[PDB]
Ligand binder design. Structure first.
Ligand SMILES: CCCCCCCCCCCCCCCCCC(=O)OC[C@H](COP(=O)([O-])OCC(O)COP(=O)([O-])OC[C@@H](COC(=O)CCCCCCCCCCCCCCCCC)OC(=O)CCCCCCCCCCCCCCCCC)OC(=O)CCCCCCCCCCCCCCCCC
Ligand SMILES: CCCCCCCCCCCCCCCCCC(=O)OC[C@H](COP(=O)([O-])OCC[N+](C)(C)C)OC(=O)CCCCCCCCCCCCCCCCC
Ligand SMILES: CCCCCCCCCCCCCCCCCC(=O)OC[C@H](COP(=O)([O-])OCC[N+](C)(C)C)OC(=O)CCCCCCCCCCCCCCCCC
Ligand SMILES: CCCCCCCCCCCCCCCCCC(=O)OC[C@H](COP(=O)(O)OCCN)OC(=O)CCCCCCCCCCCCCCCCC
Ligand SMILES: CCCCCCCCCCCCCCCCCC(=O)OC[C@H](COP(=O)(O)OCCN)OC(=O)CCCCCCCCCCCCCCCCC
Ligand code: SF4
Ligand code: SF4
Ligand code: SF4
Ligand code: SF4
Ligand code: FES
Ligand SMILES: [K+]
Ligand SMILES: [Zn+2]
Lengths: 129, 103, 115, 95, 263, 176, 205, 96, 209, 115
């Protein structure tokens, strides 16, 4: 079908030598693959649906002139979005980044009952409505 | 003086507009478009606005569409004055540049 | 037949002295090349259909201006060039064999947007 | 506009036009720099009734692309009807 | 076995008896709007923002309180449902104050966001707005009760989670006021949590007041060391400075609460 | 509709051929070009006498930034940070804290005038007409550091140009 | 025109300089005056109108030689047609609002922003977060002064664009500078650059 | 109000000043420290408290659409005056 | 289509493009993987990477396509995909006053055949894709950086390339030339989390994971 | 799975030939580069730098990655031979203005927090 004369390459994919990233920011960084925690000030859950990859925080110092926050870390604002955990781990492995993976924390199903607010002999009865 | 090969090297004004736009909101990205063809500013804005409106599935009101055409054609005068007179300036004719740049 | 046009209006597109005779040649050559494509290939069925439609118009209209209004392809010199391109395309479809089944399906989520 | 009659004649003749009719320098024919205040109108959605947003919500009427074909004697067609030929201008066909 | 089939927009989902319409919609990825329902508090059913249409029924039902019945088709995006959310949001914003620039909740406010997604885009309220006097309840929680939407989350939290029956509702009708009535301090080791559950800027952090906006903070997911429980926290930083500490959900350690010392 | 710009056939009668012969030999169409530049020599030039005369501007002109006050002297800015969020260039840095009287006010309001693109989005987004772009445009400096405005510099600009700034907002706020 | 059109020195510098065939122009990606100078009848204002260009009347200039002189005549004649359109826009200007009356896309008027709760919320969100754009990718083009200017804008459902590819018409034109300069001198390449109407803000982006 | 630190440097309305040993004071040698002399905290305090007869008062900052978003201030408390969160003007209810 | 603020639909063009999409998929089943038409009437043909030259040649030369103009050619980087790159061809037909979009895919190491033989316009668009994404085009007449500086390492338009890069230039008086050093920013770019935690568009809700 | 389309080389043995061919081109070019650009380095320093660059990727075993490295290396060579690069671009391989950063744990400990 695919008449292209393919070859065989039985080694793990690795593109660290062709991505142009300096050695300092490959072997010393620590990627963090995680599903962002819900912002506790809001009840919305639309920002907890994709996996992110962020890097370890590094020093920020005050600019002597204006007091602005300065950085020497080129990857400080880098956030990558991935559809699944396996996709994120694949991207980190081929770039030569050491990574920590945190399994998604999903809310457990809860048994809600408006009627329990007015129980005859249980402590779920509320004193105010 | 015969030209055997032309090899334009560009990127001496490459600033990463397309990568910077990815860090802006759709409104924050609009002023980038005045600075692409900086002789046809309001025409670049219109192309961007037509694209976002198309994805937004909204329609600008009739009076805005007439202003945009009106300033679309004033902008075409700005660009063609720049194009023709500088084209003539590089060919040795400098007087028309001054007459039309007062327009 | 009509008077010969002095120009086509398109730079580099020379006027054709014999538009009808040249069109009959190119369409006939196309239908011969399409005979080497398998009978069920959609390219053959569609390309023969449209080629026959244009060939009939060429045979049923001696006036060039009136022929142009029927073919709806601009100047008659543009229609000849498109015949030359279609013939070149058919000669290349045989080598490519696009009528064969899909070479390879994409990965599971290749065309899924958003991600 | 302060040119003497003689200089007006000389410059009109040297160019072949009546320049005074169309001067490229502006004069009191321009608008006043102070203008009366406006009172701009309101849009079609400025209503107190029969104006629910779900009946004019453009963004929420957009849909995902409709899949025509997916790999997961019929007549031939073109992307659209062939373009109609332009007609020569009657205002000024030849420049 | 005991699961009952219900339909969300026609899609079938199998749920346990006693599951609410809101919970059934969660199993298909649809989040119903809410202001008073919290999954860790008792059901209240008084904001009406979760009203949703049930096919073949004329009255919209409260999604947070109505149990699903076998065979129901929940229409989470119908015209009747969408007009209910616009009517309720219109009532919520009628007396709400125009404090958004001066309000700490701006940018992370459920009333703001759900007003963009489910409410209308303009006002037709031509009267004067209500204004309530503030109520001091301690040095940690700032109180600006003109922004309160009478959702009673703080009342239910203080009574069920904290165990302190000091917050209530005094008044009636449009003059109903949340507070302590008497001049009292809501002092507890869990008191700071009413800032997070309050959907609006009526309850805010006093130490954090005016210092930052939500969108400019970086969220570093860390751990707490004030005690030995190990509560999971989020540390908000802004240009190299710690701005506040927020809870991070962990179902097995702290859920979405942290102690006041940790906060 | 289209038109031809250079599709014309010249006449071939002896009078038209001689007319073109006279044009070739006597440079008639070049003499005509001289006559057009001679006309300009006798027109009034369009130059203005800067700095004694200034090019016309409008109340919408977007110049140097300024922080305004209420008529009582209180700062209009209440540290909402809408300007900082909408600034395309991220030229605005803001910090805020409760003031000694409990007011929501800023402790830092910096505009890097070398990042700014003078677009006016900040004054559009300000809900209290606090940050505005004034009418000043003649504020060149001899050093880079002088273009990093802080809050004191912005309040001084507002107190300097308030008389003009207020009159320009009065002339254009109904269009906003 | 008195200075340039019939000037023999100007015609020497531009006639038969940088000839491009109609077939080559299409394949090299040219647009605008670069196509119309070779005789191709194409203009997006008439074939794919946008805004209210179908409510105005104007003529599209067409070249015959495909050289720098026909493209100069096309540009000078397009300036005349722009005045023709401006006359029609000054007379057909209608009354009404100037931005879409949907406050989840366009910000409300400042008077309403300071009086209405819904208007302040939308002003706040439209200037901090922006308006979310439904997912999807579009290619939208206009007849810009220099040619076909378009953007391939990709949205992912959020308030920030995912991808924004810009199609600068001069990028394709400049790519053709090597073909159009064949057989010419140094002074002619100076003329060919100006006929393509290149600005490097768009070519380089 | 504008006051000078012991070393002579002026203090801004935000309370900022350089310590006697801070090397950053070198930037002001041969130049001046820009300080706004109209402290807004003092000027607002000079405005009189407005007496009103209603339990609820509205402030738009004055000037209509040229002020700030209209907010409504509750004046039920007698111990303190209601203050506008936008512009700092104070209101008091007549005879409670 | 009487609603002032809503964009009217053109269902005549939607049917025509849908009909022509099937037409192409019937003629090139070896390469066509998915066809779709958007709600604003833009036809997309998604093909296998092997079909770049056959598909584009058919769309340029077939009498019922005549897409003689390559409007634009660009890449989009989607890291979560196995093939992270998405090569997009935007074609214009002057004969039929229509537009079509052809899309394929590739990764860091798999080449894609150069379309210069089909469209002379693709010469620089493929240089830009290589320069800005690192996608190699086989048999390109001359492939090299077009936008980035000489000696520039990396591909800026990849999603994992930092916004400010890794190096920056200044002038050093000791060596009397412009040098390149690791990037340090006086003010770090301030990352804003603008996404709202509430779903905006129910029509695009993806099935739960 | 594991069957991939090659770029230039079907195996490492074929790929290494292109590496050696590229090395010979760079080796013969350094004398010209040190001459045209008027660099104040020696032909030995330049050829040592070329060796340093090649040994930096001596651990690669994927032929495709090697093919891209040769492709990128040939682009670098083309930029240098045609003097598209300037003296500043050719001296960026030597980092003359970068102060030597610490390597041992103690030196890194004293100056900052980075690993
Ligand atoms: C060659 C001969 C040139 C003649 C001198 C120029 C002249 O007098 O033109 C007058 C007059 C002014 O022409 P204009 O362009 O219409 O002036 C515009 C306003 O009407 C008049 O413009 P205005 O409103 O500005 O009038 C005030 C202006 C008018 O000043 C004048 O009087 C004009 C200059 C004359 C001296 O006053 C000045 O500015 C005087 C200071 C400038 C003097 C500079 C020339 C000094 C002579 C230099 C040579 C010295 C040796 O031109 C004529 O009418 C025809 C002049 C040719 C015939 C002259 C011999 C018969
Ligand atoms: C009846 C008896 C029979 C014999 C009678 C004969 C009488 C007539 C005698 C012949 C008249 C010839 C006039 C001179 C012609 C020379 C010019 C020429 O060759 O034309 C063709 C040339 C070239 O014309 P061309 O470019 O169109 O090409 C001509 C040849 N073909 C068309 C075949 C290619 O024209 C020029 O010389 C251009 C001039 C250069 C621009 C100079 C700037 C203009 C300056 C204008 C001001 C001049 C002021 C001069 C006065 C100064 C006073 C001190
Ligand atoms: C400064 C003081 C003011 C006076 C200065 C003198 C100004 C002279 C130049 C302006 C002339 C006005 C422009 C004009 O009418 O030209 C158009 C006119 C007409 O331009 P045309 O190209 O349309 O020709 C029309 C007639 N046909 C086409 C048949 C040829 O040009 C002329 O007629 C000028 C002819 C003069 C030829 C002189 C060349 C020989 C010179 C000998 C040495 C002296
Ligand atoms: C040389 C010396 C300067 C000329 C002497 C001044 C000219 C005589 C006074 C005058 O201006 O009248 C000349 C008259 C111009 O008047 P005109 O413009 O045609 O009509 C009035 C429109 N407002 O009509 C004329 O201009 C006659 C034409 C000028 C005479 C030829 C000069 C050739 C140089
Ligand atoms: C009347 C003006 C007298 C004063 C002019 C003084 C200047 C002389 C230099 C300019 C040349 C003009 C003199 C030539 C004769 C012109 C009159 C003439 O030719 O008769 C008019 C007649 C009408 O022309 P028509 O019929 O419409 O079309 C031409 C068809 N042969 O045309 C004809 O049909 C007759 C045949 C035309 C062909 C004859 C060859 C003409 C060209 C020869 C070169 C003339 C110039 C030689 C001198 C050069 C130096 C200036
Ligand atoms: S609670 Fe929300 S809507 Fe109300 S003022 Fe505060 S930010 Fe605005
Ligand atoms: S103060 Fe907040 S949590 Fe309590 S009832 Fe009011 S809005 Fe709800
Ligand atoms: S004018 Fe524009 S770029 Fe300048 S500070 Fe204001 S928002 Fe930022
Ligand atoms: S200047 Fe205006 S928009 Fe900016 S922080 Fe102050 S009040 Fe907000
Ligand atoms: S969330 Fe159901 S009524 Fe409040
Ligand atoms: K809150
Ligand atoms: Zn006020």
């Amino acid at each position: 079908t695919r008449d292209t004369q393919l070859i065989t390459v039985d080694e793990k994919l690795d593109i660290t030598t062709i991505t142009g990233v300096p050695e300092e920011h490959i072997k010393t960084r620590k990627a963090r693959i995680f599903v962002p925690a819900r912002n506790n000030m809001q009840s919305g859950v639309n920002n907890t649906k994709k996996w992110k990859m962020e890097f370890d925080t590094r020093e920020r110092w005050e600019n002597p002139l204006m007091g602005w926050a300065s950085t020497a870390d080129p990857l400080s604002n880098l956030v990558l979005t991935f559809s699944t955990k396996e996709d994120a781990v694949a991207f980190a492995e081929k770039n030569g980044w050491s990574y920590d993976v945190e399994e998604r924390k999903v809310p457990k199903p809860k048994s809600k009952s408006y009627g329990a607010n007015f129980s005859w002999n249980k402590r779920t009865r509320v004193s105010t409505k | 003086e015969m030209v055997r090969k032309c090899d334009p090297h560009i990127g001496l004004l490459h600033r990463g507009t397309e990568k910077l736009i990815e860090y802006k909101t759709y409104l924050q990205a609009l002023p980038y478009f005045d600075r692409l063809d900086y002789v046809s500013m309001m025409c670049n804005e219109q192309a961007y606005s037509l694209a976002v409106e198309k994805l937004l599935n909204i329609r600008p009101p009739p009076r805005a569409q007439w202003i945009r055409v009106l300033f679309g054609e004033i902008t075409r005068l700005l660009n063609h004055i720049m194009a023709v007179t500088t084209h003539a300036l590089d060919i040795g004719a400098m007087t028309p540049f001054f007459w039309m740049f007062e327009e | 037949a009509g008077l010969l046009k002095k120009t086509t209006g398109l730079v580099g597109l020379a006027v054709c002295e014999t538009p009808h005779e040249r069109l009959k040649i190119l369409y006939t050559k196309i239908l011969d090349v399409l005979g080497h494509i398998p009978k069920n290939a959609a390219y053959r069925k569609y390309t023969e259909q449209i080629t026959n439609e244009k060939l009939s118009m060429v045979k049923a209209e001696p006036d060039v201006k009136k022929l142009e209004e029927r073919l709806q392809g601009g100047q008659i010199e543009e229609v000849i060039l498109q015949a030359e391109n279609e013939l070149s395309l058919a000669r290349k479809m045989i080598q490519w064999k696009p009528w064969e089944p899909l070479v390879e399906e994409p990965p599971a989520s290749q065309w899924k947007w958003p991600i | 506009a302060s040119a003497t009659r003689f200089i007006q004649w000389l410059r009109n003749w040297a160019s072949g036009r009546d320049l005074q009719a169309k001067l490229q320098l502006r004069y009191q024919e321009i608008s006043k720099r102070t203008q009366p205040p406006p009172k701009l109108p309101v849009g079609p959605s400025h209503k107190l009734s029969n104006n629910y947003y779900c009946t004019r919500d453009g963004r929420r009427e957009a849909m995902p692309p409709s899949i025509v074909m997916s790999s997961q004697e019929k007549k031939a067609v073109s992307p659209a009807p062939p373009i109609k030929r332009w007609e020569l201008s009657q205002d000024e066909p030849y420049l | 076995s005991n699961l009952i089939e219900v339909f969300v927009d026609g899609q079938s989902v199998m749920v346990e008896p006693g599951t609410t319409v809101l919970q059934a919609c969660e199993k298909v990825g649809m989040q119903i709007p809410r202001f008073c329902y919290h999954e860790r508090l008792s059901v209240a059913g008084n904001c009406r923002m979760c009203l949703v249409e049930i096919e073949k029924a004329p009255k919209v039902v409260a999604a947070c309180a109505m149990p699903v019945m076998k065979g129901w088709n929940i229409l989470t995006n119908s015209e009747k449902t969408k007009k209910a959310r616009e009517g309720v949001m219109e009532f919520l914003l009628a007396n709400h104050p125009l404090d958004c620039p001066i309000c700490d909740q701006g940018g992370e406010c459920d009333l703001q966001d759900q007003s963009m997604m489910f409410g209308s885009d303009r006002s037709r309220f031509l009267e004067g707005k209500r204004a309530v006097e503030d109520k001091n309840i301690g040095p940690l929680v700032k109180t600006i009760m003109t922004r309160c939407i009478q959702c009673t989350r703080c009342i239910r939290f203080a009574s069920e989670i904290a165990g302190v029956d000091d917050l209530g509702t005094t008044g009636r009708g449009n003059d109903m006021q949340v507070g302590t009535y008497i001049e009292k301090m809501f002092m507890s080791e869990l008191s700071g949590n009413i800032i997070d559950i309050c959907p609006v800027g009526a309850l805010t952090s006093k130490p954090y007041a005016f210092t930052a906006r939500p969108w400019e903070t970086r969220k570093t997911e860390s751990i707490d060391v004030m005690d030995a429980v190990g509560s999971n926290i989020v540390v908000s930083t802004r240009t190299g400075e710690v701005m506040r500490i927020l809870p991070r959900m962990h179902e097995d350690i702290n859920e979405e609460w942290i102690s006041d010392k940790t906060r | 509709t289209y038109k031809y710009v250079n599709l014309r056939e010249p006449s071939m009668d002896m009078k038209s051929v001689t007319d073109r012969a006279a044009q070739t030999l006597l440079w008639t169409e070049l003499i005509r070009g001289l006559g057009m530049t001679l006309s300009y020599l006798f027109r009034e030039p369009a130059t203005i006498n800067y700095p004694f005369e200034k090019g016309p501007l409008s109340p919408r002109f977007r110049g140097e930034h300024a922080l305004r006050r209420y008529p009582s002297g209180e700062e209009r800015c209440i540290a909402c940070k809408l300007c900082e969020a909408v600034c395309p260039a991220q030229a605005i840095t803001i910090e805020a804290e409760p003031r000694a009287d409990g007011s929501r006010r800023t402790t830092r309001y910096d505009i890097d005038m070398t990042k700014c693109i003078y677009c006016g989005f900040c004054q559009e987004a300000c809900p209290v007409d606090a940050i505005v772009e004034g009418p000043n445009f003649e504020f060149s400096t001899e050093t880079h550091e002088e273009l990093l405005y802080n809050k004191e510099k912005l309040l001084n600009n507002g107190d300097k140009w308030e008389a003009e700034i207020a009159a320009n907002i009065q002339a254009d706020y109904l269009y906003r | 025109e008195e200075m340039l059109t019939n000037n023999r020195i100007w015609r020497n510098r531009t006639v038969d300089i940088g000839i491009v065939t109609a077939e080559d122009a299409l394949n090299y990606g040219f647009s605008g005056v670069m196509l119309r100078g070779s005789g191709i009848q194409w203009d997006l204002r008439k074939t794919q109108p946008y805004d209210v260009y179908d409510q105005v009347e104007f003529d599209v200039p067409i070249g015959s030689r495909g050289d720098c002189y026909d493209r100069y005549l096309c540009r000078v004649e397009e300036m005349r047609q722009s005045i023709r359109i401006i006359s029609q826009c000054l007379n057909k200007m209608p009354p009404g609002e100037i931005k879409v009356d949907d406050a989840k896309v366009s910000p409300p008027k400042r008077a309403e922003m300071k009086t209405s709760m819904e208007s302040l919320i939308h002003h706040f969100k439209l200037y901090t977060e922006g308006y979310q754009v439904p997912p999807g990718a579009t290619y939208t083009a206009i007849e810009a002064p220099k040619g076909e200017f378009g953007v391939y804008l990709v949205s992912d459902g959020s308030s920030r664009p995912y991808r924004c590819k810009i199609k600068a018409p001069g990028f394709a034109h400049l790519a053709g500078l090597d073909k159009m300069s064949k057989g010419h001198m140094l002074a002619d390449v100076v003329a060919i650059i100006g006929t393509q109407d290149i600005v490097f803000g768009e070519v380089d982006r | 109000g504008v006051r000078t630190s012991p070393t002579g440097e002026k203090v801004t309305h935000t309370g900022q000043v350089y310590d006697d040993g801070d090397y950053r004071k070198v930037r002001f040698v041969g130049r001046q420290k820009e300080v706004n002399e109209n402290f807004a905290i003092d000027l607002i305090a000079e405005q009189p408290v407005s007496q009103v007869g209603s339990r609820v008062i509205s402030c738009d900052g004055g000037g209509g659409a040229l002020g700030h978003p209209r907010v409504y201030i509750n004046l039920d408390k007698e111990t303190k005056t209601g203050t506008c969160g936008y512009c700092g003007l104070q209101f008091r209810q007549q005879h409670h | 289509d009487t609603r002032p603020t809503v964009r009217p639909r053109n269902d005549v063009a939607h049917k025509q493009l849908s009909a022509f999409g099937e037409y192409v998929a019937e003629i090139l089943p070896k390469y066509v993987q998915q066809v779709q038409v958007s709600c604003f009437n833009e036809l997309e043909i998604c093909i296998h990477p092997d079909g770049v030259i056959p598909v584009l040649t058919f769309l340029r030369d077939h009498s019922n396509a005549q897409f003689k103009s390559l409007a634009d050619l660009t890449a989009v980087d989607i890291p979560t995909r196995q093939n992270r790159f998405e090569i997009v061809y935007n074609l214009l037909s002057l004969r039929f006053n229509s537009r079509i979009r052809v899309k394929t895919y590739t990764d860091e190491l798999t080449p894609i055949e150069s379309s210069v033989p089909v469209y002379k316009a693709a010469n620089w668009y493929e240089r830009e894709i290589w320069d800005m994404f690192g996608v190699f085009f086989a048999n390109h007449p001359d492939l090299r950086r077009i936008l980035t500086d000489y000696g520039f390492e990396g591909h800026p338009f990849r999603k994992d390339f930092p916004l400010s890069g890794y190096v920056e230039l200044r002038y050093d008086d000791e060596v009397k030339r412009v040098v390149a050093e690791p990037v340090e920013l006086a003010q770090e770019f301030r990352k804003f989390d603008l996404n709202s935690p509430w779903e905006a568009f129910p029509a695009y809700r993806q099935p739960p994971e | 799975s594991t069957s991939v389309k090659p770029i230039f080389s079907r195996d490492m043995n074929e790929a290494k030939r292109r590496v050696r061919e590229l090395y010979r081109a760079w080796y013969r070019e350094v004398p010209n580069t040190v001459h045209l650009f008027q660099l104040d380095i020696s032909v030995k320093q330049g050829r040592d730098k070329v060796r340093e660059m090649f040994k930096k990727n001596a651990h690669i075993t994927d032929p495709r990655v090697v093919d891209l490295l040769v492709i990128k290396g040939k682009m670098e060579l083309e930029e240098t031979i045609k003097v598209w690069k300037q003296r500043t671009h050719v001296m960026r391989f030597f980092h003359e203005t970068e102060a030597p950063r610490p390597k041992d744990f103690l030196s890194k400990f004293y100056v900052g927090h980075d690993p």
